Amino acid sequence: EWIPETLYNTAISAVVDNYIRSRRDIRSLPENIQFDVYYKLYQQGRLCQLGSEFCELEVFAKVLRALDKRHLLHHCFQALMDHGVKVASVLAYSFSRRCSYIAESDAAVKEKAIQVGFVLGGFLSDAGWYSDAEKVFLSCLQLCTLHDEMLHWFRAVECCVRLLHVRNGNCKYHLGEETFKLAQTYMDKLSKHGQQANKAALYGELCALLFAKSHYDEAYKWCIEAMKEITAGLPVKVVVDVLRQASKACVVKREFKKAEQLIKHAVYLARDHFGSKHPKYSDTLLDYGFYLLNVDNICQSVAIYQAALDIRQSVFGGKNIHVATAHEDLAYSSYVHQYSSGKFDNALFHAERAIGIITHILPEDHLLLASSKRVKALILEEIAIDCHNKETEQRLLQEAHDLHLSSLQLAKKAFGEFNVQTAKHYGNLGRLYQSMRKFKEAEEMHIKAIQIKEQLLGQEDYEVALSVGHLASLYNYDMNQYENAEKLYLRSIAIGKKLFGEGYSGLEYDYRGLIKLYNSIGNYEKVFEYHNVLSNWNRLRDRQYSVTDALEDVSTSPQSTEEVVQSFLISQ
Amino acid sequence: EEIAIDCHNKETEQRLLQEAHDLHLSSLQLAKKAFGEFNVQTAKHYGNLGRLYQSMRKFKEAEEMHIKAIQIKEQLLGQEDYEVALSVGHLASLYN
Amino acid sequence: AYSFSRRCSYIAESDAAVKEKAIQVGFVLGGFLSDAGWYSDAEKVFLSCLQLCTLHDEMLHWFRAVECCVRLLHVRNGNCKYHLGEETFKLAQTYM
Amino acid sequence: DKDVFQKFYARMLAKRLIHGLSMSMDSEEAMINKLKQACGYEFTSKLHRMYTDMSVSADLNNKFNNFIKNQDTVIDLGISFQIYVLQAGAWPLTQAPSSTFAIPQELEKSVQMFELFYSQHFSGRKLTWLHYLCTGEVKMNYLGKPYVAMVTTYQMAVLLAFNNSETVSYKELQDSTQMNEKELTKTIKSLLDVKMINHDSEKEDIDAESSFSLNMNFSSKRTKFKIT
Amino acid sequence: LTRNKGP
Amino acid sequence: LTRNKGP
Amino acid sequence: WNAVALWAWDIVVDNCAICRNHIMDLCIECQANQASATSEECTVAWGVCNHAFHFHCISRWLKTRQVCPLDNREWEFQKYGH
Amino acid sequence: MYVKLISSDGHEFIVKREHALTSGTIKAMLSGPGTNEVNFREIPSHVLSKVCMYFTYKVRYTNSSTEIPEFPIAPEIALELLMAANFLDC
Amino acid sequence: TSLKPRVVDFDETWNKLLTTIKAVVMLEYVERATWNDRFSDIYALCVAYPEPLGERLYTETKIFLENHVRHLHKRVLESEEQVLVMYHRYWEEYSKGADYMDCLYRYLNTQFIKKNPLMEIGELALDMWRKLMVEPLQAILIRMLLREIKNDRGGEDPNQKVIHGVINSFVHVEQYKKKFPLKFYQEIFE
């Protein structure tokens, strides 16, 4: 019934309770006991006594080497950051002071101050404090760039590839290409001396840099190189990241046959090495849910964001950007999944939460608020149009207008006026005005979205198809231009059937719109024909519910890494 | 409920009445688990549920709630008492 | 409360002067927590004081067990532990 | 304190109802109904469920006998299987069943087939079997006169091993039943009170070493009797 | 209106 | 329900 | 063979988290008004998240919020009792 | 049946084998090459006395059905005993 | 002295530990007081200041292990027509030494190996035995096993301990592989 408490744990409780008399003698304990003492300080509620101990780099370097007990550390560190203790900023400042002091010392000491820098920067990047890990990585970069011998070149390149990651996640993409050029020079002068370095880790970061910049055509060409650079001896971290970014790049190029091959292998590999409750496996699941959302398999996609959030929400505490991105992704898939049903209380909860987290841990202006404030605005549209009260949905329209304008301003400041993300914001704001009774500039915003997307993406993607269908519903349902919307509806249906089979979920909103268009201008024969094919589409979608979840889809050991990489390269 | 009674919107009234339903049933469960079935506070929650049922147009079991509250109030606290008077006032308002 | 209970469990097997000091510290601390509203965190202090009162059956411990049992009863009515309140009061009558 | 009286009554009503002894089911219904109007429905909420479970018992058994006849394959239990399901949240017979059990193939067919019937008749309900209240009338005919005795399933496991083979060691008995060791001392002691099994061993205290054998010299005044 | 205050 | 999901 | 079998719902949570009552007892709705009127139909309903609640409570819960009370997932029934 | 343990201060502590098997590494102390002799050059007498008392506390209170009282590890002997608890895997 | 971390010199304690490890792997004899001293040193090496020396200790214990297995494999090579009988006794001695090595490195096996790839010290011995000695001579050591068991049906019975002490040797060298308790033994011999 009752099991006696371990003597080790009882001594930990005794040492913690005797904290004031022995607060500094704990720092002399082995790094195994130190983590347990500090975890007992966290568990007992002594967050104020623990913040003063994790804000010291001397203490935090020893507690960071408990690699087995890291999932607790991520949940303690976050517990302090929610507590009000700026542990990340103080650790970054302490490392900056340390590197500025030890810059001119011996290179052996500088090498030790780099390994401590790498683990601390990697932790702060894993925890989601990218801006606070930017300072640590820059400080380590200065140390490894002061010298020029063969030993520090590899450290410099590793710090550059790690430093590119903390800039992509921080939405500091304008420094991303500068850091890539810096690492390009470093590896170019590596190639001069004979020693060769792996480029897969570096290229996979550009695969996210250009993807977030919506340079999909260039991101694909870089992910080809990234998958070519995969070797047998790479760590599973690098391989999982490369496969994940390759899947993300292949989705937007509409190459879904091989994107699944990469993402399922990435999911299996991350689940095999790291585990089912690991933050990197949560990242892999989050991008797997992105893939499944972009293949019209939404029923299997909302169950993966919920699986990817539950890993991040249990590891990274309450108010973290990793939890925030999981919410804003889940608030979009639950938006799409419940779009026909109309149940947007769950999707709004994950939308108000992500905004409530980013607005607390990130400044008032930041590109990560562009995606979070857009999604909540999308849920605010569908609740409003389905609301029984009109004065309440008027205010909902007003708040959605404010959110779309804020997200559009952030996107325009980040990139400009002719970007794919800004085209998406234009289309969303025109879709808003379609219910806000502001049609005359709604059509202008839709046209702007179409031309911006066609200039970059072209006419072989469904991203243009959503805007085409939105403009077609604009003309058909309110603007009364019935004749010119028929070609837009036909374009939407044709390009939807081109990619997502005959059961694309967006074809219902085109069919029931074009039938309404025809029911006012005659030609009842095509009305009957589309009523005939709409039942076929309904039964096709009903048969294609895909009750099997994606965890059973990825299975266990489909193939090794070599087969996947060679298949992807031969397919190209 | 009193905001729901004193508002014109049907959807808002329904939502707030359901919220008050949840709160009253949870409070009744807490009182029933702590004190018991036959006690004054459980009868308070029974009378509140009766008033709420009268507000949610469910008059069938509002009467059941009101006699259920009265039979516990007048038993423990005597036939003539303040809360017995309040509960029979709610019952009379429900009737007439 | 945890620190006080652990320290009392440690110094239970000591002389009456240190136990008097510990009971005074527990009285002021538990009275503060009961005044602050941390009744669940004030029972532990008061239960530790009451435990300190039972090791020796002298006059002063018998006198202060009633004080621990009346302050323990107050942190159990505000915490709605009415089932434990009757047991605490029976113990209070035992010492009284 | 009427509530503590219910605890004495509910346990004592449980013993009365499931053993088949009662003046009448109407008197049991009238007693619980009269307590309902004297102390409230919540006082007799569990007791009224106990009587209702016996009402369902007739309705459950005949449907089970209807189920065994509406079977694609010919399935026969071979015993007069009488069952009644009991609500776990009302009856006080739960206690702490810390002793596992493994019935042999005589009743394994009956217990297994009833699960298929009960899972399809009622959805989401799992069956927990109180093996130490199950009393069965087994054909006792290994000796010259076919005596009839009332034994429990706990007593049946010891007896069934002896029905097939008259010489069974205690070491095999304590492992085949897969149940607690301290109660096995009094399990077979009750059988030796009526002399079901000879004390083949020489030690007065019954232990693991004491291998036993059945009694060919057993005689009873009545053909049908209950072993206490 | 229509009733008295809640107990 | 007239439009499609937001892009 | 006279045998005794305790039937119970195979939920291990054994508490309706909406009404805080036991999963085997009647819900707070069936113990308040329908206790003396009609209390035999108070069954439990599961969900995709595998969190069973009293069917009256979860339908009472679904009238305002359509998520599972314990974990904020979309609520869809998968199994009833009858 | 009994095993004796030597502190760094020369003290000898004799405890039953079943009590001493609670520690993870005392099992390895009794394993390998062959009353068994066990010596610690680091562990002093007071912390080893505390560990030996914890053995009797652990075995007696193992899988008990009552409220197990907490082992009184005194505040002054807390870190030296915590180091011993980690090393002994006790 | 106490159990605190100190700045211990790795070379001298490594030289002290090598004699005991050598006395363990061939199962000759170890002084029990010296064994307790080796425990007291295996603790202090894993928690040494400023940087723990568990990594260096592991990566040098594996070097000692691999050169020991290489020397014994050369001994197997030079012993013509007696590979199996000598293999049985050497494998028994090595397995007992590996168990005593797992006991010897208990603290390193539960505070640094489990923290991280790396393998358990007791499981590293068997793994190195099968991946450094068995791999060069997997074909030769099995042809005689099949010939002896076939000759038993043919009349020439083999010795009991010679043939039964190797059929379980393949079983024991995959104990750490919990996913393959017997897969390797079935595929290469049976």
Next chain:
Amino acid sequence: DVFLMIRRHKTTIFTDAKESSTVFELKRIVEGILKRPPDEQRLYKDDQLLDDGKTLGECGFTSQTARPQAPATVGLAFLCIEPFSSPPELPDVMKPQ
């Protein structure tokens, strides 16, 4: 039950003698590990001699006094029991330096 320790100037004997057993059983326990007859050696609680037929239960070895957490100490003479080498003292914190 009674848990107590038996010390002879450098040792400590951890026993589990019940309240029923008297001094003779502990003498046999000591003989089982130290090989000394009860006639040769006698135990000393504090500075008092225990009769062999006198049960330890009335010798102050109650359950609440001799729990396994802090077992009772008895001296063994074949006293001068060496102290346990008490751990270093801690600063009193509130002591003014």
